[PDB]
Design a protein around this ligand. Structure first.
Ligand SMILES: OC[C@H]1O[C@H](O[C@H]2[C@H](O)[C@@H](O)[C@@H](O)O[C@@H]2CO)[C@H](O)[C@@H](O)[C@@H]1O
Ligand SMILES: OC[C@H]1O[C@H](O[C@H]2[C@H](O)[C@@H](O)[C@@H](O)O[C@@H]2CO)[C@H](O)[C@@H](O)[C@@H]1O
Ligand SMILES: OC[C@H]1O[C@H](O[C@H]2[C@H](O)[C@@H](O)[C@@H](O)O[C@@H]2CO)[C@H](O)[C@@H](O)[C@@H]1O
Ligand SMILES: OC[C@H]1O[C@H](O[C@H]2[C@H](O)[C@@H](O)[C@@H](O)O[C@@H]2CO)[C@H](O)[C@@H](O)[C@@H]1O
Ligand SMILES: [Ca+2]
Length: 516
């Protein structure tokens, strides 16, 4: 893995449940058998959306957790674990959605203004989720939902491995900047989503709070605004993305815009911890979308990310660390293209996010963005997951592998692995002053024969004069590997004589000793 390390010893594979309720897909008996099958193939738990639209449909405080309880009961029967997603967003309208579950219709009547929803540059209204700007409503509604959910699911605390919060559309912390109705669907540029009167007034107040008066604003932005009412979001999103973002005004606008999502992260994180920490004592997470298109567009750099709310990932992740939430990046199975017209750079994006997450010490999880129908994609996922320290991978979605034995078998082999610590020992290595010994092998957990970025470092044992190290390997999988010497300058000086193998790696910790 990166930095001479190996895969994450806590790695676990998860499976996404269908978007619809199980009884709308199959029966509970078959579902339970499917879970036993998933477990046999390396899956630790199943993640599942519990829709706000289902749990508090009739009215405020009129809860119904009967489906969640019945679902948990079957997970318990199958001897599996589950990861509930408290989905306070609408099901339907997003890529892959095969459902129709809007959030409670009554929630929209708690306000007379336009503080609750989103409005784009061109006026498109979006109601897939509550606008994070309305923190007072979010505090009340999510607070009540989380606490009621916690009380009703207490009897199943033993089958809950983690809890996911929904930070926005599709359960991701972002703005609904790419939708069909707004004409911003992939691979188009996104449109900013802060044009409701409430949003305009909030940005205005934020600007005035920062500088104090209009004169100080004009002096900081180098503008000549005639009055406070002239302080507004970008009138032309495209021109803003072309060069307006480089100005002092642009930096402030994007700081505020992304700032709303950061404050939202801290709010829901606090509500969730206060509601679940004592009862469940399990990790809590949130998701960030992989907006990979228009990444390297020369005319509008990061033209899809900025409108989605992603301007500074480092600053964004600091909000997660502060709120004590683990992060999940929802797009790992893709490769870079970076050509007109998509200017898509998914892999580079994943690498950047993973690097930042590891530096900050934030637990990182991943998912595939679209259904995988080919083994080649599993390999891509494996390379990223096992070389960038991911603690977990969630496969979208249920049916893809449950009804395809060959695919399920390939997932078991490549991703449904149980990590086990093993000791690798290499003797008679002709190292000289300044050399370091590494190992690399055929599988992704071994760096896939890469000697540049992914090799695993070994340590010299001055007492027995050999090189050794405790490395995390995939139990019960066949591996081939070789040790090699790396000079002080970084060049590969020589390789181990014979290629080593472990067929397969044992499930119990032991050691593999070989000679140069
Ligand atoms: O709030 C001030 C001003 O902001 C916007 O104009 C920006 C523009 O969006 C940027 O791309 C760049 O050109 O700087 C401008 C301000 O100097 C709004 O379009 C405008 O209505 C508003 O007054
Ligand atoms: O927020 C939903 C979803 O959006 C993006 O998925 C893209 C996908 O990568 C493209 O290949 C194409 O299908 O358009 C989709 C958007 O509608 C993000 O990549 C993903 O992380 C996110 O879950
Ligand atoms: O069941 C989880 C989640 O799935 C869908 O959103 C996905 C999207 O399809 C993929 O790109 C994935 O990688 O990221 C998103 C979140 O995991 C549904 O649209 C969403 O409502 C649902 O919660
Ligand atoms: O390119 C991947 C390749 O890596 C290893 O081959 C080494 C070989 O072991 C060395 O003796 C020397 O020839 O450099 C090669 C790298 O090009 C693996 O042994 C091999 O199986 C694998 O395909
Ligand atoms: Ca309520």
């Amino acid at each position: 893995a990166v930095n001479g390390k190996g895969m994450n010893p806590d790695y676990k594979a998860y499976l996404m449940a269908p978007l619809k309720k199980i009884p709308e897909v199959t029966n509970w008996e078959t579902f339970e058998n499917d879970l036993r099958w998933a477990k046999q193939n390396g899956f630790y738990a199943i993640t599942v959306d519990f829709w706000w639209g289902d749990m508090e449909k009739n009215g405020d405080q009129q809860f119904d957790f009967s489906y969640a309880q019945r679902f948990a009961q079957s997970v318990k029967n199958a001897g599996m674990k589950m990861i509930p997603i408290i989905s306070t967003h609408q099901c339907g309208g997003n890529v892959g959605d095969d459902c129709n579950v809007p959030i409670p219709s009554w929630v929209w009547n708690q306000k007379s203004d336009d503080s609750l929803y989103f409005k784009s540059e061109t006026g498109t209204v979006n109601k897939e989720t509550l606008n994070p700007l309305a923190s007072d409503v979010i505090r009340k509604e999510y607070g009540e939902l989380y606490t009621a959910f916690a009380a009703a699911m207490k009897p199943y605390k033993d089958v809950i491995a983690k809890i996911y919060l929904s930070g926005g559309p599709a359960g991701e912390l972002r703005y609904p900047s790419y939708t069909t109705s707004d004409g911003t669907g992939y691979p188009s540029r996104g449109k900013f989503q802060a044009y409701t009167e409430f949003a305009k007034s909030k940005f205005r107040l934020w600007v005035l709070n920062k500088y104090g008066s209009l004169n100080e604003v004009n002096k900081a932005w180098g503008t000549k605004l005639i009055s406070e009412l002239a302080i507004l979001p970008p009138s032309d999103g495209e021109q803003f993305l072309m060069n307006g973002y480089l100005s002092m005004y642009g930096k402030d606008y994007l700081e505020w815009y992304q700032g709303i999502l950061e404050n939202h992260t801290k709010l829901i994180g606090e509500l969730a911890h206060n509601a679940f920490d004592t009862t469940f004592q399990v990790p809590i997470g949130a998701k960030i979308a992989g907006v990979h298109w228009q990444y390297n567009n020369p005319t509008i750099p990061h033209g899809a990310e900025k409108p989605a709310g992603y301007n500074d990932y480092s600053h964004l992740l600091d909000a997660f660390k502060s709120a004590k939430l683990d992060v999940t990046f929802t797009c790992l199975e893709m490769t870079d293209k970076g050509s007109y017209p998509e200017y898509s750079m998914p892999k580079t994006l994943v690498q950047n996010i993973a690097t930042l997450a590891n530096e900050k010490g934030i637990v990182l999880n991943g998912e595939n963005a679209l259904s995988i129908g080919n083994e080649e994609e599993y390999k891509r996922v494996a390379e990223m997951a096992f070389n960038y320290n991911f603690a977990g991978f969630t496969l979208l979605r249920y049916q893809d592998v449950m009804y395809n034995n060959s695919l399920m078998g390939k997932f078991k082999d490549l991703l449904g692995v149980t990590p086990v610590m093993q000791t690798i020992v290499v003797k008679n290595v002709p190292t000289t002053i300044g050399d370091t010994v590494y190992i690399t092998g055929n599988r992704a957990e071994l760096g896939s024969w890469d000697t540049k970025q992914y090799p695993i470092q070994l340590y010299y044992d001055s007492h027995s004069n050999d090189w050794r190290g405790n490395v995390v390997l995939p139990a019960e999988r066949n591996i081939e590997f070789k040790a090699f010497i790396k000079s002080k300058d970084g060049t590969v000086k020589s390789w181990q004589t014979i290629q080593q193998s472990w067929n397969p790696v044992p499930l119990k910790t032991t050691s593999h000793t070989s000679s140069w």
